[PDB]
Amino acid sequence: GSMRSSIEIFNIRTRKMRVVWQTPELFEAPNWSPDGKYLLLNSEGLLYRLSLAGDPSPEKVDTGFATICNNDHGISPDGALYAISDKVEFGKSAIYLLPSTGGTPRLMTKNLPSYWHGWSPDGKSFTYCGIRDQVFDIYSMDIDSGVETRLTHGEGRNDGPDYSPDGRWIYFNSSRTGQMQIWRVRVDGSSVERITDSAYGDWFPHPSPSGDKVVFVSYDADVFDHPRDLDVRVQLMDMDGGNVETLFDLFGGQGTMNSPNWSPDGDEFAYVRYFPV
Numbered sequence: 001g002s003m004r005s006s007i008e009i010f011n012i013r014t015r016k017m018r019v020v021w022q023t024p025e026l027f028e029a030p031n032w033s034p035d036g037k038y039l040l041l042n043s044e045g046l047l048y049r050l051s052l053a054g055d056p057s058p059e060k061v062d063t064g065f066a067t068i069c070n071n072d073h074g075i076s077p078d079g080a081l082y083a084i085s086d087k088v089e090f091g092k093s094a095i096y097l098l099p100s101t102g103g104t105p106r107l108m109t110k111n112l113p114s115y116w117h118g119w120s121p122d123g124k125s126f127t128y129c130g131i132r133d134q135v136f137d138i139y140s141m142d143i144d145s146g147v148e149t150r151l152t153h154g155e156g157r158n159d160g161p162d163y164s165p166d167g168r169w170i171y172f173n174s175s176r177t178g179q180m181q182i183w184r185v186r187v188d189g190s191s192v193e194r195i196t197d198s199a200y201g202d203w204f205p206h207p208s209p210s211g212d213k214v215v216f217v218s219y220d221a222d223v224f225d226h227p228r229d230l231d232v233r234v235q236l237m238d239m240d241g242g243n244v245e246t247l248f249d250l251f252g253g254q255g256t257m258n259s260p261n262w263s264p265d266g267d268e269f270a271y272v273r274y275f276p277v
Contacts, residue, residue, distance in 0.1 A: 005255075006273040007039065007050060010247060012213060012236060013267045017248075020270075021056040028255035029071035030270035032263050034079040039270050042069050047084065062102030065089070071258035072115040075100060077123045083108075085116045085128075095128060097143070108141060111148065118162035118170065118260055120187075127151075127161040127170050138172050138185060151189045162260050163187070164207045164239065171195065171205040171214060179221055182214070182241070195241040200233070201226075204257050207239065210266025214239060215247070217256055228254040229274060251275065 001024030010017045020039065021027075027048070031040040039050045041058065045068040048058035063069060066086035070093055073084045082100050085093045093113035096105030108114075108126075115129040120140075130139045130148075136157035140149045152158040156176025163170055170187060173180045177194070180201035185192040196202045200218035203226050207214050218233040219226070230253045237244040250256060252274045261269045 003275050004277070006275070007041065007056075007270065008273055009263075009268050009270050010234070011268045012208075012215075012247070015247075020052065021050055021058075023058075026255070027058070028272060029073070029258040030261055030272065031073065031075050031259050032261060032268075032270050033075055034077055034264050036264055040073065040075055040082070041272075042071055042073060045069050045086075047073065047082070063098060064104045066096060066098075066105045070115070071255060072117055072128075074116060074119050074126075074260050076119055077121060083116045083119065083126060085114070087113075095126075095141075108143070108146070109148070114139070115159075116259075117160055117172075120163055121165055121167040125187075127163060129159045129161065129172075138170060140170070140187065149189070151185050151187075152192070155192075158183075160204050160258075162206050165209045165211045165266075169207075171207055173203055173205065180219075180226075182216060196237070196244070197241075198244070202235070203253075206257065206260050206262060206269070208262050208266040208269075209264060212239065212266075213237065215257070215261070215269050217250075217253060218246075219253060226254050228252070229276065232256070234271065 003022045005027040006022045007020045027041045027043045047061035050056045068087045069084045095108040095114045095116045098105045118127045127140045135154045138151040138161045156174040158174045161170045161172040169184045171184045174183045182195040182202045205216045232253045233246045257271045
């Protein structure tokens with residue numbers, strides 16, 4: 001079988017890349033463990049750990065009944081929990097938490113579909129895209145109480161939320177201006193503001209844990225939604241949207257970086273490059 005996915009890391013300080021693992025399988029959306037030691041990927045509804053030292057061969061995570069996981073998942077700051085978005089139970093995406101060492105998923109969201117997208121720096125809350133009667137909004141939930149908080153209110157479609165490391169902002173994208181652009185909303189909901197103003201559809205914002213940079217993908221403007229297998233750009237900019245640059249061109253899009261992908265040191269991020277079928 002020819003290669004289909006290349007799990008890779010790019011260091012934004014030295015501007016060097018490395019190939020962790022290539023496979024003829026379709027692997028997607030890496031997270032990076034808070035201890036620095038492994039990547040968490042999904043493939044064909046299952047979750048896998050790939051060690052960054054020694055054997056990078058994917059090791060399957062026991063997600064119990066949750067065997068139709070999608071690309072929206074993450075790891076808690078203390079490293080003890082995984083959050084997954086799975087459709088076994090209700091036929092549409094629902095968010096669960098489980099131990100990072102595997103086990104039985106605990107349902108978080110009763111209102112569906114909901115797509116997990118970022119863990120709060122203090123670990124107490126998470127943020128997600130919730131679709132409610134075809135209204136795409138940013139929500140957050142307090143893990144201990146189960147209380148759902150709506151942060152956007154149907155101004156365009158709003159997707160892909162992830163926290164700034166100071167915990168004051170959630171960055172996301174919104175179609176409110178005509179194409180997907182990066183926006184940010186305060187965690188209390190109280191203000192929102194535009195971060196990119198580009199000729200592209202800008203998707204998957206991830207603020208670096210080091211608090212200086214945001215990485216994201218830019219599709220061509222004539223693209224609708226966030227498909228697989230297109231010629232895209234992996235971009236980087238300052239927190240305030242200044243100094244936008246193209247780090248590299250890439251064949252991909254969907255799967256490349258859906259979920260929070262930074263090393264805990266904030267100097268490197270994980271991503272998947274694809275090869276045409």
